[PDB]
Design a protein around this ligand. Structure first.
Ligand SMILES: *C(=N)[C@H](C[C@@H]1CCNC1=O)NC(=O)[C@@H]1[C@@H]2[C@H](CN1C(=O)[C@@H](NC(=O)C(F)(F)F)C(C)(C)C)C2(C)C
Ligand SMILES: *C(=N)[C@H](C[C@@H]1CCNC1=O)NC(=O)[C@@H]1[C@@H]2[C@H](CN1C(=O)[C@@H](NC(=O)C(F)(F)F)C(C)(C)C)C2(C)C
Lengths: 306, 306
């Protein structure tokens, strides 16, 4: 009953959050086993960030220059290295709350939960999508850098995002946990803009299935369409092409509701060409594209985590 | 940068979730110190729930009939009692993860986070409002009963909601942690309907302030209004009357933005009488009323929890 944007329970990630200070710059770090991961611009003054030479700034630092605080306990730093745009601080204490984890690089269209943190302390959790233009539509203030995005599978936390910056129009950019940015962005205070974004078609279809599962059914028309003809229409309205892989991923929802993916594509085609005429779907006046097919299954089938 | 529905970090509550089974009925319980709290209808068969006599059903149970599982560990039950619609199971082990906590009864219009659980295990977290008709618009499946709603203040978890049932139109109903239902509902499978709902006016105003803080400003008109005249208009569109207490609670946002509450009331009055003309506010095509003034401050000022 009901369908909501829903984040993963954050407790496993909360126990990994620490504060990292270098000089007068403080941000969040992620403490897994005996390594703390954080954005490399913790080593920058405000003036360094206009055109930093990270390798140069880092050669002038030593272990003791990094103040790492887990709550009210300082963690002694015994090694450091730079991996792409991420700094790795080796500490002399393994985090006893470390969950089973992986580092993954997610694909555009996939969703994850963000645990927004300041000074190493969690402020809130929300659900995000990696946009096709490799930005995310988050909520972040000064000092949020080093907040992470993650998915959970039973007992395993898959970390996929570390926050670094905000761009014009207010969208956010960051890296995977190997320090590689999503998209063409750089961690420098210089002129940068996101490319034009597009609508994640497979996710809109997943969300229409969620609507049907939840009894919100007015938009279902009596028609079908071809994959080729749907994608012709989708292009006009700035929607990602639907691939056969996407059709296959939608199969569980298609089987659950008895609606073929291409039949649902016919209904979405009408909605795009005609609008929603002041009606809502699942309480929303716009078509929603930040639920994956898995998100829909997970929420409508009550999948839990251990 | 950005404004999102954002839940409290759930870790403190995750460490209190347990599974409670009686007979063949299983649901979630909340384990604080040496007491487990859960909905009393765990003692009902499917047929009992049509017209249960809870006192009668409970007199036929003894301590050993209650199977309480915290992960893979069974907690021995050494006492039980019924308090309104909640069952309290005394166990022989205090929960070592118990946070500092309070039980509170929230008022209509206030928000909280729900940790949706199945079989004692957390599935996800989302933000909810107590509606003026004493329902909540949640996302709950079979077996979710005993999931709780809560707010966090620094280190203190204020539990305010325990989930019990879903009503026609798909809205949900439940109790505070003393077992008293919000609204006129009863924990019986019988014909029940929510009253007509209304829009939480103070929260819409808080959300308009969030829009201004985030630079989304088109709806601001050049006018002002009286409290009396605004509420005349608000009545027509099924909005709660705005009280002076509400004006005072909005003062921090009014001071932050330089916009008097009654000036913002003039802008909201235009939006109601005129619509949004296909425009969005903070990405939304409808006026949003599930952010409190505190929610707005907390998200735009980065308040954290310890
Ligand atoms: C980390 N704590 C912050 C998070 C930012 C701050 C406000 N909202 C956020 O998401 N990260 C930064 O301040 C980064 C950081 C230098 C500058 N920066 C920016 O986000 C800047 N953005 C850009 O220069 C642009 F447009 F290219 F993205 C700023 C103008 C301050 C918003 C570094 C090392 C990139
Ligand atoms: C607890 N696990 C469930 C949560 C429900 C189940 C589906 N979505 C939810 O939120 N609670 C119940 O099944 C409760 C419970 C008996 C019956 N019940 C209902 O929710 C029923 N609702 C009503 O009878 C109504 F309309 F009055 F609210 C049901 C028809 C099964 C949806 C008790 C003890 C009230």
């Amino acid at each position: 009953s009901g369908f909501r944007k829903m984040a993963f329970p954050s407790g496993k990630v909360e126990g990994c959050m620490v504060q990292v200070t270098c000089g007068t710059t403080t941000l969040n770090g992620l403490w897994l086993d005996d390594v703390v991961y954080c954005p490399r611009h913790v080593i920058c003054t405000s003036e360094d960030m206009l055109n930093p030479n990270y390798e140069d700034l880092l050669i002038r630092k030593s272990n003791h220059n990094f103040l790492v605080q887990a709550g009210n306990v300082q963690l002694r730093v015994i090694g450091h290295s730079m991996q792409n745009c991420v700094l790795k601080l080796k500490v002399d204490t393994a985090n006893p709350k470390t969950p089973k984890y992986k580092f993954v690089r997610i694909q555009p269209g996939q969703t994850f939960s963000v645990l927004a943190c300041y000074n190493g302390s969690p402020s809130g959790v929300y659900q995000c999508a990696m946009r096709p233009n490799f930005t995310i539509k988050g909520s972040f203030l000064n000092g949020s850098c080093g907040s992470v995005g993650f998915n959970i599978d039973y007992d395993c936390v898959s970390f996929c995002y570390m926050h670094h910056m905000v761009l014009p129009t207010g969208v956010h950019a960051g890296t995977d946990l190997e320090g590689n940015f999503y998209g063409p962005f750089v961690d420098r205070q210089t002129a940068q803009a996101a490319g034009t974004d597009t609508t994640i078609t497979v996710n809109v279809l997943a969300w229409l299935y969620a609507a049907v599962i939840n009894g919100d059914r007015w938009f279902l028309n009596r028609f079908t369409t071809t994959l080729n003809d749907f994608n012709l229409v989708a292009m006009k309205y700035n929607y990602e092409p639907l691939t056969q892989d996407h059709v296959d991923i939608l199969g569980p929802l298609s089987a659950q509701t008895g609606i073929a993916v291409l039949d649902m594509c016919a209904s979405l085609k009408e909605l795009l060409q005609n609008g929603m005429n002041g009606r809502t779907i699942l309480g929303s006046a716009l078509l929603e594209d930040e639920f994956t097919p898995f998100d829909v299954v997970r929420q409508c089938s009550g999948v839990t985590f251990q």
